[PDB]
Structure formats: C-alpha cells, structure tokens
CSV table of C-alpha atoms and ligand atoms in Angstrom, one decimal:
chain,number,residue,atom,x,y,z
M,1,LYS,CA,154.5,27.3,166.3
M,2,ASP,CA,155.4,28.4,169.9
M,3,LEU,CA,155.8,24.8,171.1
M,4,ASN,CA,159.5,24.7,171.8
M,5,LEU,CA,160.3,22.3,168.9
M,6,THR,CA,163.4,20.1,169.3
M,7,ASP,CA,165.7,20.4,166.3
M,8,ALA,CA,164.9,16.8,165.5
M,9,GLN,CA,161.3,17.8,165.4
M,10,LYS,CA,161.7,20.6,162.8
M,11,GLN,CA,163.7,18.2,160.6
M,12,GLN,CA,160.7,15.8,161.0
M,13,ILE,CA,158.4,18.7,160.1
M,14,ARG,CA,160.3,19.7,157.0
M,15,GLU,CA,160.1,16.1,155.6
M,16,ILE,CA,156.4,16.1,156.4
M,17,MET,CA,155.6,19.2,154.5
M,18,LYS,CA,157.8,18.5,151.5
M,19,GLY,CA,155.9,15.2,151.3
M,20,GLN,CA,152.7,17.2,151.1
M,21,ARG,CA,153.9,18.5,147.7
M,22,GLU,CA,143.3,27.4,136.0
M,23,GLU,CA,140.0,27.2,137.9
M,24,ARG,CA,140.3,30.9,138.5
M,25,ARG,CA,139.8,31.7,134.8
M,26,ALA,CA,136.3,30.1,134.8
M,27,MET,CA,135.4,32.0,137.9
M,28,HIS,CA,136.5,35.2,136.2
M,29,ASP,CA,134.4,34.4,133.1
M,30,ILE,CA,131.4,33.8,135.3
M,31,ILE,CA,131.8,37.2,137.2
M,32,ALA,CA,132.5,39.2,134.1
M,33,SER,CA,129.6,38.1,131.8
M,34,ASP,CA,126.6,40.2,131.0
M,35,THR,CA,124.3,37.8,132.7
M,36,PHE,CA,124.7,35.5,135.7
M,37,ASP,CA,124.3,31.9,134.6
M,38,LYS,CA,123.3,29.9,137.7
M,39,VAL,CA,123.7,26.4,136.1
M,40,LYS,CA,127.2,27.3,134.9
M,41,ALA,CA,128.1,28.7,138.4
M,42,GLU,CA,126.8,25.5,140.0
M,43,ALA,CA,129.1,23.5,137.7
M,44,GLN,CA,132.1,25.7,138.6
M,45,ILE,CA,131.4,25.3,142.3
M,46,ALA,CA,131.1,21.5,141.9
M,47,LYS,CA,134.4,21.4,140.1
M,48,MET,CA,136.0,23.5,142.9
M,49,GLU,CA,134.9,20.8,145.4
M,50,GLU,CA,137.4,18.3,143.9
M,51,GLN,CA,140.3,20.7,144.5
M,52,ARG,CA,139.1,21.7,147.9
M,53,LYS,CA,138.8,18.0,148.8
M,54,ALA,CA,142.4,17.3,147.8
M,55,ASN,CA,143.7,20.4,149.6
M,56,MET,CA,141.8,19.8,152.8
M,57,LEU,CA,143.0,16.2,152.9
M,58,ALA,CA,146.6,17.3,152.4
M,59,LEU,CA,146.3,20.0,155.1
M,60,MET,CA,144.6,17.7,157.6
M,61,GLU,CA,147.0,14.8,157.0
M,62,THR,CA,149.9,17.1,157.4
M,63,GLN,CA,148.7,18.6,160.6
M,64,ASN,CA,147.9,15.1,162.0
M,65,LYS,CA,151.4,14.0,161.3
M,66,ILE,CA,152.8,17.0,163.0
M,67,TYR,CA,150.6,16.5,166.0
M,68,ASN,CA,151.8,13.0,166.4
M,69,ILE,CA,155.5,13.9,166.6
M,70,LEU,CA,154.6,16.1,169.6
M,71,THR,CA,155.0,15.4,173.4
M,72,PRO,CA,151.9,15.5,175.6
M,73,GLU,CA,152.9,19.0,176.7
M,74,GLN,CA,153.4,20.2,173.1
M,75,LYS,CA,150.0,18.6,172.1
M,76,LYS,CA,148.1,20.4,174.9
M,77,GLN,CA,149.6,23.6,173.6
M,78,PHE,CA,148.9,22.8,170.0
M,79,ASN,CA,145.2,22.1,170.9
M,80,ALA,CA,144.8,25.4,172.9
M,81,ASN,CA,146.4,27.2,169.9
M,82,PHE,CA,143.9,25.4,167.6
M,83,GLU,CA,141.0,26.8,169.7
M,84,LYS,CA,142.1,30.4,169.4
M,85,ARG,CA,142.9,30.4,165.6
I,1,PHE,CA,139.4,44.7,144.4
I,2,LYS,CA,141.5,47.7,145.1
I,3,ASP,CA,138.6,50.1,144.9
I,4,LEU,CA,137.5,51.7,141.7
I,5,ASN,CA,136.4,55.4,142.3
I,6,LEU,CA,132.7,54.4,142.8
I,7,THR,CA,130.2,57.1,142.0
I,8,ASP,CA,127.4,58.0,144.5
I,9,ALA,CA,124.9,56.1,142.4
I,10,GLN,CA,127.2,53.1,142.3
I,11,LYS,CA,127.6,53.2,146.1
I,12,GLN,CA,123.8,53.0,146.4
I,13,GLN,CA,123.4,50.3,143.8
I,14,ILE,CA,126.0,48.2,145.7
I,15,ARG,CA,124.1,48.8,148.9
I,16,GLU,CA,121.0,47.4,147.3
I,17,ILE,CA,122.7,44.3,145.8
I,18,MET,CA,124.1,43.4,149.2
I,19,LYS,CA,120.6,42.9,150.5
I,20,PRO,CA,130.3,27.2,160.9
I,21,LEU,CA,131.9,26.4,164.3
I,22,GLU,CA,130.9,22.7,164.3
I,23,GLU,CA,133.0,22.1,161.2
I,24,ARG,CA,136.3,23.3,162.8
I,25,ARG,CA,135.7,21.1,165.8
I,26,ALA,CA,135.3,18.1,163.5
I,27,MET,CA,138.5,19.0,161.8
I,28,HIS,CA,140.2,19.3,165.2
I,29,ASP,CA,139.1,15.7,166.1
I,30,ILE,CA,140.6,14.4,162.9
I,31,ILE,CA,143.9,16.2,163.3
I,32,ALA,CA,144.4,15.4,167.0
I,33,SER,CA,144.1,11.7,166.8
I,34,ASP,CA,146.9,9.1,166.9
I,35,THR,CA,146.1,8.1,163.3
I,36,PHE,CA,144.9,9.9,160.2
I,37,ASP,CA,141.5,8.5,159.3
I,38,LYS,CA,141.0,9.4,155.6
I,39,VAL,CA,137.4,8.0,155.4
I,40,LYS,CA,136.2,10.1,158.3
I,41,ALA,CA,138.2,13.1,156.8
I,42,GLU,CA,136.4,12.8,153.5
I,43,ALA,CA,133.1,12.7,155.3
I,44,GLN,CA,133.9,15.8,157.3
I,45,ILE,CA,135.1,17.6,154.2
I,46,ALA,CA,131.8,16.9,152.3
I,47,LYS,CA,129.4,17.6,155.2
I,48,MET,CA,128.8,21.3,154.4
I,49,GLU,CA,128.6,20.9,150.6
I,50,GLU,CA,125.1,22.4,150.4
I,51,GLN,CA,126.0,25.4,152.6
I,52,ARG,CA,129.2,26.1,150.7
I,53,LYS,CA,127.1,25.9,147.5
I,54,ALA,CA,124.5,28.4,148.6
I,55,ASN,CA,127.3,30.7,149.9
I,56,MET,CA,129.4,30.6,146.7
I,57,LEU,CA,126.4,31.1,144.5
I,58,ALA,CA,125.3,34.2,146.4
I,59,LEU,CA,128.8,35.6,146.4
I,60,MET,CA,129.2,34.9,142.7
I,61,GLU,CA,125.9,36.5,141.7
I,62,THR,CA,126.7,39.5,144.0
I,63,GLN,CA,130.0,40.0,142.2
I,64,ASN,CA,128.5,39.6,138.8
I,65,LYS,CA,125.9,42.2,139.6
I,66,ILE,CA,128.5,44.7,140.9
I,67,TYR,CA,130.7,44.1,137.9
I,68,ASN,CA,127.9,45.0,135.6
I,69,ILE,CA,127.2,48.4,137.2
I,70,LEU,CA,130.9,49.4,136.4
I,71,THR,CA,132.0,51.7,133.6
I,72,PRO,CA,134.2,50.3,130.8
I,73,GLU,CA,137.2,51.9,132.5
I,74,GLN,CA,136.4,50.4,135.9
I,75,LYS,CA,135.8,47.0,134.3
I,76,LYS,CA,139.3,47.1,132.8
I,77,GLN,CA,140.7,48.0,136.2
I,78,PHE,CA,138.8,45.3,138.0
I,79,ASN,CA,139.8,42.7,135.4
I,80,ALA,CA,143.5,43.6,135.6
I,81,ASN,CA,143.4,43.4,139.4
I,82,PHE,CA,141.7,40.0,139.0
I,83,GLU,CA,144.6,38.7,136.9
I,84,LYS,CA,147.2,39.8,139.5
I,85,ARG,CA,145.8,37.9,142.5
Z,1,LIG,CL1,141.7,34.8,136.0
Z,2,LIG,CL1,138.1,23.5,167.2
Z,3,LIG,ZN1,123.9,28.4,130.8
Z,4,LIG,ZN1,149.8,10.0,152.5
Z,5,LIG,ZN1,119.1,51.0,142.7
Z,6,LIG,ZN1,126.2,25.7,166.0
Z,7,LIG,ZN1,138.9,22.4,169.0
Z,8,LIG,ZN1,136.1,16.8,169.6
Z,9,LIG,ZN1,137.1,5.6,160.7
Z,10,LIG,ZN1,128.1,15.6,147.7
Z,11,LIG,ZN1,122.4,19.5,146.2
Z,12,LIG,ZN1,119.1,35.7,142.3
C-alpha cells in the first residue's frame, strides 16, 4: 500500500475491511488414513469450494471497494502493483 | 511439515511418490471496475474448478502416501505439527 493514502482514505479503508467480517480436521483424517479414499477426497474438495467461494467473493469485493476510493494516479499505481504481486 | 529425520530409504520413497495466469487477469478485471459484479465474480471463481480438483487430489494422495511411509514416532510428530498450523 505505497499509494500515498489520504487519512480520509485509510478511514474509508478500515470501514471497508471491518465490513468484510473445522474443514481442516477432515483433511487431516484423509491424509492420515491407511488408504487413500478418492471419493471421500473428492467430497472434501467439493466442500472446500463453498468456503473458497465465500472467501474469494469477500476478497474481491473488498479490493474493488478500495480501488474505487482511489484517484486516477493511485489506481494506475494499484494496477501496476497488482501486476507484480 | 517441520521435517522429520527422514531415513535414506524414506528419501528415495518420497522421490518416487513425487513422480494459471489467465485466472489472475480475470480477477484483476473484476477488481478494477467501477462496480463490483457479483455474477461475473462467481463465474470467474468457478472457472478453474476441474483444475483445482485434479491438483488437490494429487496433493492429497501424495501426502497420504508419504504419511504412510513414516514410523509411529514420525507420524506423531507430523500429526502434532498438523494441529498447530
Ligand atoms: Cl486438524
Ligand atoms: Cl493480473
Ligand atoms: Zn470411501
Ligand atoms: Zn456486500
Ligand atoms: Zn521405492
Ligand atoms: Zn496461458
Ligand atoms: Zn493484471
Ligand atoms: Zn483485463
Ligand atoms: Zn455482469
Ligand atoms: Zn461446478
Ligand atoms: Zn467434474
Ligand atoms: Zn493414484
């Protein structure tokens, strides 16, 4: 975040993120069994897609809201930074 | 997986067991837009479902096979490191 954010911008950013706001045990059970059960692993993977979906949507909506409180200069810089991360 | 004092045999066995960009650009387009298009976002998120599936399945089967070449004492170490992650 090397974009020279106005202090009104960071306030806007805090409110954005705070408004953005288990499965690992099943993964462990799959890895640590005597045999690899492919159908059971397919079902775990499919269940992980529901959480991935919710997390990607949150991430992308958050970053879209940040981008749109930016000036044309800050946007250009954000986009260059995106290309190199 | 803070390593586990693998034996020579185990190093060979792991050796044997062990035998993109378009998606980030689409995420970029969704983020750097003057509105957040949730429908297009859901489509983007789902596009690589089959590739993610084949990748996770491979990874999970690899990790299950490595787990099962471990000694009882290495299994306990691997399982305790799994719980603190
Ligand atoms: Cl766990
Ligand atoms: Cl990109
Ligand atoms: Zn089964
Ligand atoms: Zn919302
Ligand atoms: Zn072998
Ligand atoms: Zn390509
Ligand atoms: Zn890009
Ligand atoms: Zn584009
Ligand atoms: Zn649309
Ligand atoms: Zn699907
Ligand atoms: Zn399929
Ligand atoms: Zn196989």
